[PDB]
Design a protein around this ligand. Structure first.
Ligand SMILES: Nc1ncnc2c1ncn2[C@@H]1O[C@H](COP(=O)(O)OP(=O)(O)OP(=O)(O)O)[C@@H](O)[C@H]1O
Ligand SMILES: Nc1ncnc2c1ncn2[C@@H]1O[C@H](COP(=O)(O)OP(=O)(O)OP(=O)(O)O)[C@@H](O)[C@H]1O
Ligand SMILES: Nc1ncnc2c1ncn2[C@@H]1O[C@H](COP(=O)(O)OP(=O)(O)OP(=O)(O)O)[C@@H](O)[C@H]1O
Ligand SMILES: Nc1ncnc2c1ncn2[C@@H]1O[C@H](CSCC[C@H](N)C(=O)O)[C@@H](O)[C@H]1O
Ligand SMILES: [Mg+2]
Ligand SMILES: [Mg+2]
Ligand SMILES: [Mg+2]
Lengths: 291, 206, 393, 287
């Protein structure tokens, strides 16, 4: 080390109603330099209402709060956050959700209940059981501990390639109508992997989210660009379930336990997540997904 | 109000009806669902199913809070413009993710094997287009098909058409004709001197 | 509240061009003082205490709330109910016939509609069967029961036992010793019998009958059938052909839209009333002897902010239709269980919504007026909530 | 094919202050099922702002409006927007930014200014036409930069998070990097890479100071490599720009890049959207 390196800050205001956290913040964002406030209550005011809502709404408000904080923290904007939360399951969670993006800090607002209900309510004390110790928590990463899955190394070496948008760019084509798929263009770098792949003992298995009905226009595309493959695995005709569901079935039924997958090449996120997160397998992501 | 409670009263009611000259086997669940139970049990959860004739009741049941892990998709069809529109409203992502709903039979493309439900249907709407629908279904690549209709002999006991068994049995015979299906019959619901209120066939392809 | 089916209802309120809903009405506040459960006095005094200088007194009619949408072409008028619905299951001929009383009292050059709130009469035009199933059934039961008690030797034998020395011995040495012993009165054998007698509710049989008969008399006046007619009482607003509208805001409109029926009009401001109360009370008691449900009191101008639209005073005779045959007797106990608030809380909202509704011009009603739709749902909630009240007010 | 897929609905309420849009959306939320409001004004209020602020806040607000809308659409949730803009196309950005994510609908609240100030003018004024757009897509090919296909064909590979698993090391103190772990499948790529006419080139953010413990890690797992370009010791500036530089000096126009294996986002973007090279991204890297 030796070096200076700084990340934005997330300042979590922790405390009860009336305890003066929104007042501090109004002063704070007005005098400090690069700060944005995020209030949960202000959010559920776009949806019209007083500050408790449907477990539908509150789950959606969470989805938004988190997105925004991350959105900003990513932008190197400091974020103060008005935790009406106050618990521990909240706090520890809050910390999990955030620290990796920025340096967390805390500011408590304790205040005698005799004084607290004099900010005019509903006479209700909260879970203030001075826990956790509110020591600042610098940014932490957690994950360079990559651990795959214990696949039988007796089974024959094999790689796995997505077709749509990984070995075969659409070039305008309709995503769901892969009949016109012999016009498709080659993502040569992936093509080049599959080449050198089969130069070592590697079985090359094509696994695709195309209707099986479009098998023929596919085999055309493949032999047109001279792709040397072992299996061609395709989605059942009239299936239409999500990609990762039908690909995973395909994986477990066929590939699984019959081969030893050395890695996978794919494009869209939904699928990459499944491969990595559910099946615990190395998968390289070739372009950008987020379809 | 309880299954256990029902267990103690059952023999009593049953014995009472013997002396009146009636063997009755009383059942707690109610003909419907007494039936839907039988179907779910019989088919299983290992093939995707084809739900012919549906307000949605059979679909929810196939999902039961993930308790039955339904891996496949779910094919469902119906003529009622009502049902179709309700099927639509479910594809405003009130779940129904693996629901394909189709109206024209030339829209069912799935070339893979399927388990089939002819809920009530072959009477309580169409008549002898039954010969049609049942014969069309038999051509489909299926594993097991279940068909249910009223017993008509059962009407004695109450207060479209309706076949007796034998009437129904003939219908099935003259739809399989000569193909290598295996076919077994049985009844569902309260039984009185042999007759239940709904008839059943379990057709399995050898 | 089911959203997919409230969405339904609101669309109808819009489709039908309805321009107002309705108030609930709270009864007059108590008078533990005068033992009147709905106090003509304490209900007028409530108002002067809150700023009325002029109030008006209308007879309260026994029918069903009906907003009349009077069109100049009388042929195309319609009727909306207590809540947001059109009434069209009446003889729209026979109805229009009764409405021409009202229609011919006006001048419709350049006036195209006149929204008028009225009582559709009589009770049984929509309420019969609720009359048959509930009200006449309560009556008959009690009346049958009373026949039995009178013809039957029952009350007699009980009274003879209640005299014997075996009993009484029991009711004394048991009023003082507590569930004891055992009460070696043969088990339970006696402890049952003499306890069940004594705890038997006797009834002043004649007084039980007089009570039953008052119920009958009332039910006979209001509850008998039924050639449709109207008792109009307030003009909500007038709608001109020339686009413009006139928000009436006057309950005294009354003496114009029908009802040459005696109302009255007093200026009781700042407790020169009390000396004014004896005349208003003197006439209302003419009204009650005169076979009516009771009386309603309203601020002379229909809408005042933060206010209820009215107070009702149902006489005690009519109230025996509401409470049992024995309201007359257990008068005090129920003055107690009573709280005019809640009603009054809703009674102000309903009206105050109703006026922001009436506020929207006739031309604008429809499914593209989301201020309409908001006020409605708001009003609809008010229903869902107000319905959960005592439901005897 | 005919399955058709169903996407969330984004509904823009176009109108000018007083119209009726926020009163519609009030009814529209309480009566419809799966719908959330996203209003730019309530975000200002979250910063304690009357209306209109520093271009700073305005810019940072925007970054979290798009955040919250996209976050919702991806949870498959219909989203309504009180477009307090409706400008001579401030609509098109709004449409270009989202059409990737949802079926876009509009509802213009038109109203004459004599009525509009039931509490001046607001120009319409357009050839816009409010046709409900479906979902979009695009990114329909890869502009892989014209490369001199005669230079020795070679591949390029990050160390940290790609080939070298930290196993909980200090990512800034690479002195212990020799006791670090191998991401075998990444290494398996470099194995077959060599065996084909490829020069394997390494390229790190490790300051040169920690080169000894690096070369040891490589020897230990017998990694076969041709170049090893690193960070100038005590350079300490953005990981991203260092590699960018090293490439344009050492590798650019001197080799032929077939693809790059990398891990951290910041970098993968640089490869793909600045230098227009193919870049396979082993595993997740959000920092
Ligand atoms: N030191 C103080 N002295 C007097 N009044 C104060 C002080 N601090 C805050 N207040 C007042 O107390 C009231 C509540 O404060 P504030 O709005 O900060 O509550 P809060 O903690 O944000 O509650 P919520 O969770 O509802 O946001 C405000 O009206 C504020 O003006
Ligand atoms: N002169 C009048 N002015 C206003 N309302 C009257 C009048 N005469 C009769 N009414 C009716 O009396 C109603 C309230 O009295 P009543 O107790 O008879 O009905 P209700 O069932 O209590 O109505 P709600 O339950 O909605 O209060 C009014 O809604 C109206 O229908
Ligand atoms: N169709 C309508 N008829 C009558 N009043 C209406 C109607 N729509 C809205 N209003 C009223 O107009 C007032 C302000 O309108 P509204 O709140 O809808 O403006 P807005 O669309 O929110 O504009 P902005 O969000 O840009 O400020 C509100 O008091 C509301 O009650
Ligand atoms: N030829 C046909 N094709 C598709 N549906 C048919 C049909 N003939 C009759 N039907 C349908 O069969 C249905 C039976 S109702 C289904 C019963 C069962 N309780 C369930 O919920 O599943 C009706 O809705 C009717 O429209
Ligand atoms: Mg793909
Ligand atoms: Mg009445
Ligand atoms: Mg890296």
């Amino acid at each position: 080390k030796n070096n200076t390196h700084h990340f934005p800050k997330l300042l979590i205001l922790v405390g009860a109603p009336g305890s003066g956290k929104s007042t501090f913040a109004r002063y704070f964002i007005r005098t400090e330099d690069n700060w944005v406030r995020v209030n949960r209550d202000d959010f559920r005011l776009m949806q019209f209402g007083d500050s408790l809502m449907s477990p539908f709404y509150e789950e959606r408000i969470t989805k938004m709060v988190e997105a925004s904080v991350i959105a900003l923290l990513k932008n190197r904007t400091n974020v103060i956050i008005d935790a009406t939360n106050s618990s521990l399951r909240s706090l520890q969670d809050m910390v999990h959700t955030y620290t990796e993006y920025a340096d967390i800090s805390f500011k408590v607002f304790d205040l005698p209940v005799e004084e607290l209900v004099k900010r005019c309510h509903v006479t209700q004390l909260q879970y203030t059981k001075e826990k956790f110790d509110f020591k600042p928590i610098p940014r932490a990463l957690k994950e360079t501990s990559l651990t795959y899955a214990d696949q039988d190394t007796s089974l024959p070496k094999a790689v796995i390639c997505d077709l749509d948008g990984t070995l075969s760019l659409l070039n305008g084509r309709d995503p769901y109508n892969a009949s016109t798929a012999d016009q498709d263009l080659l993502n040569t770098p992936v093509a080049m992997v599959l080449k050198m792949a089969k130069q070592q003992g590697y079985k090359v298995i094509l696994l695709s989210g195309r209707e099986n009905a479009y098998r023929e226009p596919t085999e055309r595309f493949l032999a047109k660009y001279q792709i040397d493959y072992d299996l061609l695995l395709m989605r059942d005709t009239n299936d239409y379930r999500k990609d990762n569901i039908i690909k995973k079935e395909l994986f477990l039924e066929e590939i699984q336990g019959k081969y030893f997958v050395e890695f996978l090449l794919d494009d869209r996120n939904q699928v990459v997540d499944m491969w990595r997160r559910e099946l615990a397998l190395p998968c390289f992501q070739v372009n950008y997904g987020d379809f | 109000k309880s299954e256990r409670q029902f267990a103690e009263i059952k023999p009593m009611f049953e014995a009472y009806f013997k002396e009146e000259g009636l063997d009755i086997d009383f059942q707690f669940t109610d003909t419907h669902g007494s039936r839907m139970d039988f179907i779910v049990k019989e088919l299983g959860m290992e093939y995707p199913i084809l739900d012919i004739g549906c307000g949605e009741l059979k679909y929810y049941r196939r999902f039961m809070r993930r308790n039955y892990n339904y891996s496949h998709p779910y094919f469902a069809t119906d003529t009622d413009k009502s049902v179709g529109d309700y099927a639509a409203l479910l594809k405003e992502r009130m779940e129904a993710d693996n629901l394909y709903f189709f109206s024209d039979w030339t829209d069912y493309e799935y070339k893979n094997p399927v388990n089939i439900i002819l809920t009530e249907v072959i009477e309580h709407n169409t008549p002898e287009a039954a010969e049609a629908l049942v014969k069309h279904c038999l051509s489909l690549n299926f594993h097991k098909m279940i068909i249910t209709t009223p017993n008509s002999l059962f009407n004695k006991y109450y207060f479209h058409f309706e076949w007796t068994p034998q009437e129904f049995q003939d219908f099935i015979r003259h739809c399989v004709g000569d193909t290598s299906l295996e076919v077994t019959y049985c009844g569902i619901g309260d039984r009185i001197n042999g007759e239940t209120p709904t008839q059943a066939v379990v057709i399995t392809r050898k | 509240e089911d959203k997919t089916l409230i969405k339904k209802r609101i669309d109808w309120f819009c489709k039908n061009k309805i321009n107002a809903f309705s108030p609930t009405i709270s009864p007059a506040p108590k008078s533990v003082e005068r033992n009147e459960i709905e106090s003509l006095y304490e209900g007028i005094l409530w108002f002067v205490l809150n700023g009325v200088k002029e109030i008006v007194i209308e007879k309260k009619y026994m029918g069903s709330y009906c907003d009349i949408y009077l069109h100049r072409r009388l042929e195309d008028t319609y009727l909306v109910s207590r809540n947001g619905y059109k009434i069209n299951h009446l003889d729209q001929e026979q109805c229009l016939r009764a409405l021409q009383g009202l229609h011919d009292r006006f001048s419709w050059d350049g006036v195209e509609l006149r929204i008028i709130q009225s009582e559709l009469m009589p009770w049984s035009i929509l309420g019969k069967g609720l009359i048959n199933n509930e009200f006449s059934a309560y009556y008959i039961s009690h009346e049958i029961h009373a026949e039995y008690l009178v013809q039957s030797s029952l009350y007699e034998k009980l009274q003879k036992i209640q005299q014997e020395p075996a009993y009484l011995s029991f009711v004394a040495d048991a009023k003082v010793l507590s569930a004891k012993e055992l009460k070696d009165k043969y088990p339970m054998h006696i402890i049952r019998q003499y306890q069940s007698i004594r705890d038997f509710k006797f009834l002043d049989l004649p007084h039980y009958q007089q009570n039953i008969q008052l119920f009958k008399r009332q039910l006979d006046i209001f509850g008998k059938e039924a050639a449709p007619f109207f008792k109009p009482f307030n003009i909500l607003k007038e709608v001109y052909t020339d686009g413009r509208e006139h928000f009436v805001n006057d309950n005294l409109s009354f003496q114009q839209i029908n009802d040459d029926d005696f109302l009255h009009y007093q200026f009781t401001d700042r407790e020169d009333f009390e000396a004014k109360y004896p005349q208003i009370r003197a006439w209302v008691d003419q009204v009650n002897q005169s076979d009516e449900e009771g009386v309603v009191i309203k601020p002379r101008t229909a809408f005042l902010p933060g206010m209820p639209p009215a107070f009702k005073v149902r006489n005690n005779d009519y109230l025996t239709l509401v409470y049992g045959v024995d309201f007359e007797d257990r008068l005090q106990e129920q003055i107690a269980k009573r709280n005019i608030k809640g009603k009054l809380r809703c009674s102000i909202n309903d009206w105050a919504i109703n006026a922001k509704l009436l506020a929207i011009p006739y031309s604008e009603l429809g499914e593209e007026n989301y201020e309409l739709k908001n006020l409605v749902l708001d009003r609809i909630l008010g229903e869902e909530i107000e319905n959960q009240l005592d439901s005897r007010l």
